[PDB]
Design a protein around this nucleic acid. Structure first.
Ligand SMILES: [K+]
Ligand SMILES: [K+]
Ligand SMILES: [K+]
Ligand SMILES: [K+]
Ligand SMILES: [K+]
Ligand SMILES: [K+]
Ligand SMILES: [K+]
Ligand SMILES: [K+]
Ligand SMILES: [K+]
Ligand SMILES: [K+]
Ligand SMILES: [K+]
Ligand SMILES: [K+]
Ligand SMILES: [K+]
Ligand SMILES: [K+]
Ligand SMILES: [K+]
Ligand SMILES: [K+]
Ligand SMILES: [Mg+2]
Ligand SMILES: [Mg+2]
Ligand SMILES: [Mg+2]
Ligand SMILES: [Mg+2]
Ligand SMILES: [Mg+2]
Ligand SMILES: [Mg+2]
Ligand SMILES: [Mg+2]
Ligand SMILES: [Mg+2]
Ligand SMILES: [Mg+2]
Ligand SMILES: [Mg+2]
Ligand SMILES: [Mg+2]
Ligand SMILES: [Mg+2]
Ligand SMILES: [Mg+2]
Ligand SMILES: [Mg+2]
Ligand SMILES: [Mg+2]
Ligand SMILES: [Mg+2]
Ligand SMILES: [Mg+2]
Ligand SMILES: [Mg+2]
Ligand SMILES: [Mg+2]
Ligand SMILES: [Mg+2]
Ligand SMILES: [Mg+2]
Ligand SMILES: [Mg+2]
Ligand SMILES: [Mg+2]
Ligand SMILES: [Mg+2]
Ligand SMILES: [Mg+2]
Ligand SMILES: [Mg+2]
Ligand SMILES: [Mg+2]
Ligand SMILES: [Mg+2]
Ligand SMILES: [Mg+2]
Ligand SMILES: [Mg+2]
Ligand SMILES: [Mg+2]
Ligand SMILES: [Mg+2]
Ligand SMILES: [Mg+2]
Ligand SMILES: [Mg+2]
Ligand SMILES: [Mg+2]
Ligand SMILES: [Mg+2]
Ligand SMILES: [Mg+2]
Ligand SMILES: [Mg+2]
Ligand SMILES: [Mg+2]
Ligand SMILES: [Mg+2]
Ligand SMILES: [Mg+2]
Ligand SMILES: [Mg+2]
Ligand SMILES: [Mg+2]
Ligand SMILES: [Mg+2]
Ligand SMILES: [Mg+2]
Ligand SMILES: [Mg+2]
Lengths: 174, 139
RNA sequence: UCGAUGUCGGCUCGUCGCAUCCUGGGGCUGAAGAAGGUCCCAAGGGUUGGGCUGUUCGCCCAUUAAAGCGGCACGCGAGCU
RNA sequence: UCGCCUCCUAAAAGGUAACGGAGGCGCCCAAAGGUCCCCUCAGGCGGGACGGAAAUCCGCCGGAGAGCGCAAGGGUAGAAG
RNA sequence: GCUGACUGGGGCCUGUAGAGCACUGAUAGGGCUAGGGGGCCCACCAGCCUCCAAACCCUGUCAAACUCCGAAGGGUCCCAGGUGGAGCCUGGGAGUGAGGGCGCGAGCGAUAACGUCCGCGUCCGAGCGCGGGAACAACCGAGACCGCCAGCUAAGGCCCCCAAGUCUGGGCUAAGUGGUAAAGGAUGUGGCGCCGCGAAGACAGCCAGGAUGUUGGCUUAGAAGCAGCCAUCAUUUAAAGAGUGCGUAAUAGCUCACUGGUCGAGUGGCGCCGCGCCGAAAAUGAUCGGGGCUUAAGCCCAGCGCCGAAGCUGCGGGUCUGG
RNA sequence: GGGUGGAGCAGCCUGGUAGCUCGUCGGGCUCAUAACCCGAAGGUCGUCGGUUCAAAUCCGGCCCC
């Protein structure tokens, strides 16, 4: 699924004030473009909580545009866990790098007897065209038994994919 | 607003609205005594004889909806075989053990107004009506 | 403060604080009663005599409603020792 | 504890205190000195009789972490080695 | 005799702040694997499998004596501005060589001291002369030649002591908070927000009902939910845990899970902000300078005025120094 | 700084197993003993949380000496 954010424009406008009005500054750039932008914080949150860079945002820019983007850097204020900038990278022809969340149906579908499983569990960086963008990728067949290490060179890899990281990290552990 | 898991799984289950002669249906005070009306809990696999849920659910927005439209009874809102096993399952209707197992609103298909004087407290209609052979018919 | 502000203990005279030792109130109790335990309010008054040792403090004898802890130049030597 | 050297403190010039932190010098070298010609480490992986983590040898890899008589710093193979 | 402090523009010099892990070490978790660590059909001696476990692989950090990086500032030279109780050179006379507080950056300390020791500034010193701060060397205002019954202001103030507003608007607090000290605590209060359920009708309450073989197997003079271990079987369900409460010579009698019912609107939870509340005990008699104040004479945001010094203006005079 | 089989004490350091003596028990040598040569039983190492797959054997509190 994709989401939308209304993405207004900005040139000067001391950013400390944008915070004092509830609007989150940012930037919009890619290989052929770079412009200064800013969003409203409130709607940004209700979106990015699930936008969670793995998914695409259209931002439906004013100026008649509707510019699809993946979020690539968020500097949250070191003090209060609250964001203070957004880097909006514009998707273009093909391809990019990105992180994709994993679904788990692996071995032994949660753990055998709760003993030594303790795997490597998060999303993963992939290279893919901007079209075959998977929502999730189920960590597959559950024959990786007690003490097996079938590393990152592993499961389904939907149509658009690349070994964008160490060909073997440790995807399954002791 | 998840709206009443009953109103899907127990909105009569969209069940037994049409089944069991979808007219004539039920009445009277979803129940006072758990002391004299037995015959639940014992039919060897399930009861299927007392009630399911939710008087208020259907009495408002369950329209005519596949029965037989008739009209005469007692008042407003508060078994398969029709008009025969009336008091042959439960609720012997005053006393029944706990007095005033009172009444409700009924409508079958022919001319029923009070219905505890004619068809509820165990009358004889399918065996005693054999008096049309030489009474008022044949001299 | 060294062209001096006499350092401990006792005596005498006290007065003040309350983080109350007893007395009068009170809550809880694993408070039956009685008698305690603990915490709360309360500074009005009261808070003993001896043996030891310079002692303060302690430790003992016999009692008691109880033998409260601190402050005042560890109060007080132009008042005494 | 007292003079000398190195680092820190020393707040991006120099300088800067304390009974602040932590270490060295009171020598040595006729070859360790001058100059000309040469040469390049330490490690790491394989291979190699007596040879082991190492003695000596061959291979490839290894821009300096070796070495520079002694502390430390700075410097350094395009050499000071 | 234009050279000075300060200033502008440039040119190099630097290794702090901050950040960083590439060196130096320190470091949490996982992986993969020397060597141990223990165990095996043991000495062929090597055969696996899961705390230590070096280097490496990601993943996260720390450092005055670590730095792949690195500002601001600072130093210096040049060209300029700058005539100043500025600069330079020769020479005469000294005094001082006990400093101190405050701000910032450190070290020693206890991230104590009106503590101590350096650094940069400043001030008292010597401005204990003037206004403010109730009082008060060094905090804020301001460098006192003398005179005047003139003016305007700075800090700070304008309800009375006490000069000038009980001034204007718009919010907040009910503690005398103001006139306070913390970890923490909690239906105080006033605003912003999120989730949760609800007109087929929810949160209060007021109507009903929680019956089985019921010994729940097991316990067991008996625990027939309510002295305990529970196969917690399931006969299910308007609904009913072989039982959350009181009950208890096991039972009688009793209540709450949960649906239904009547009444018919909001309800219950989570986070945030501004202000307040508890936490809060010390020694002569109390109090915020005092009286007194609570849509303020208290706090937050605006604004208009006025008061206010030996500051600057006005007028007169004094010397000194230039022209 | 000490708290260990009944008494006395090693084993901690260097964490994968608690052992000697004496006592006790039974046997060997005696003609029968004493001693002596051999084993037998028995502690969890004051106690509390942690570490580790392991700790009386590492760490820290309280305790008693
Ligand atoms: K004097
Ligand atoms: K003196
Ligand atoms: K009491
Ligand atoms: K008293
Ligand atoms: K004594
Ligand atoms: K006293
Ligand atoms: K005297
Ligand atoms: K005396
Ligand atoms: K030579
Ligand atoms: K000039
Ligand atoms: K410069
Ligand atoms: K590092
Ligand atoms: K001179
Ligand atoms: K100073
Ligand atoms: K001065
Ligand atoms: K007050
Ligand atoms: Mg005198
Ligand atoms: Mg005198
Ligand atoms: Mg008191
Ligand atoms: Mg009393
Ligand atoms: Mg009593
Ligand atoms: Mg005597
Ligand atoms: Mg005596
Ligand atoms: Mg006495
Ligand atoms: Mg004293
Ligand atoms: Mg004293
Ligand atoms: Mg005295
Ligand atoms: Mg320097
Ligand atoms: Mg400097
Ligand atoms: Mg080598
Ligand atoms: Mg070197
Ligand atoms: Mg300049
Ligand atoms: Mg730093
Ligand atoms: Mg540094
Ligand atoms: Mg750079
Ligand atoms: Mg010039
Ligand atoms: Mg001068
Ligand atoms: Mg001197
Ligand atoms: Mg001096
Ligand atoms: Mg000095
Ligand atoms: Mg000084
Ligand atoms: Mg000075
Ligand atoms: Mg400041
Ligand atoms: Mg001082
Ligand atoms: Mg200080
Ligand atoms: Mg200090
Ligand atoms: Mg001093
Ligand atoms: Mg002086
Ligand atoms: Mg004075
Ligand atoms: Mg004053
Ligand atoms: Mg003053
Ligand atoms: Mg002054
Ligand atoms: Mg003057
Ligand atoms: Mg005026
Ligand atoms: Mg003003
Ligand atoms: Mg007045
Ligand atoms: Mg007013
Ligand atoms: Mg007060
Ligand atoms: Mg209700
Ligand atoms: Mg107002
Ligand atoms: Mg004049
Ligand atoms: Mg002059």
């Amino acid at each position: 699924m994709e989401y939308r954010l209304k993405a207004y424009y900005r040139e000067g406008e001391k950013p400390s004030a944008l915070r004092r009005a509830g609007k989150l500054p940012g930037v919009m750039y890619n290989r052929h473009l770079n412009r200064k932008v800013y969003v409203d914080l409130v709607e940004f949150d209700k979106v990015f909580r699930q936008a969670s860079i793995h998914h695409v945002i259209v931002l439906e820019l004013p100026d008649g545009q509707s510019l699809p983007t993946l979020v690539r850097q968020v500097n949250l204020d070191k003090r209060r866990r609250r964001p203070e900038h957004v880097d909006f990278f514009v998707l273009s022809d093909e391809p990019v790098e990105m992180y994709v969340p994993l679904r788990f149906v692996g071995t032994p579908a949660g753990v055998r007897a709760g003993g030594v499983l303790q795997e490597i569990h998060r999303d993963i960086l992939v290279k893919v065209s901007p079209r075959n963008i998977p929502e999730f990728i189920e960590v597959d067949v559950s024959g990786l038994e007690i003490g097996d290490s079938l590393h990152a060179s592993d499961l389904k890899l939907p149509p658009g994919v690349e070994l964008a990281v160490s060909p073997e990290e440790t995807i399954a552990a002791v | 607003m998840p709206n009443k898991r009953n109103v899907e799984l127990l909105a009569t289950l969209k069940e037994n609205l049409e089944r069991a002669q979808g007219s004539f249906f039920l009445v009277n005070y979803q129940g006072l005594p758990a002391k004299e009306t037995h015959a639940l809990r014992q039919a060897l696999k399930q009861n299927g004889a007392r009630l399911f849920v939710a008087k208020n659910t259907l009495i408002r927005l369950a329209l005519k909806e596949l029965g037989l439209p008739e009209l005469d009874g007692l008042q407003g809102p508060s078994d398969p075989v029709a008009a025969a096993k009336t008091l042959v399952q439960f609720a012997k209707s005053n006393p029944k053990g706990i007095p005033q197992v009172k009444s409700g609103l009924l409508q079958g298909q022919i001319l029923t107004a009070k219905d505890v004087e004619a068809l509820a407290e165990l009358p004889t209609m399918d065996e005693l009506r054999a008096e049309l052979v030489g009474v008022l018919q044949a001299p």
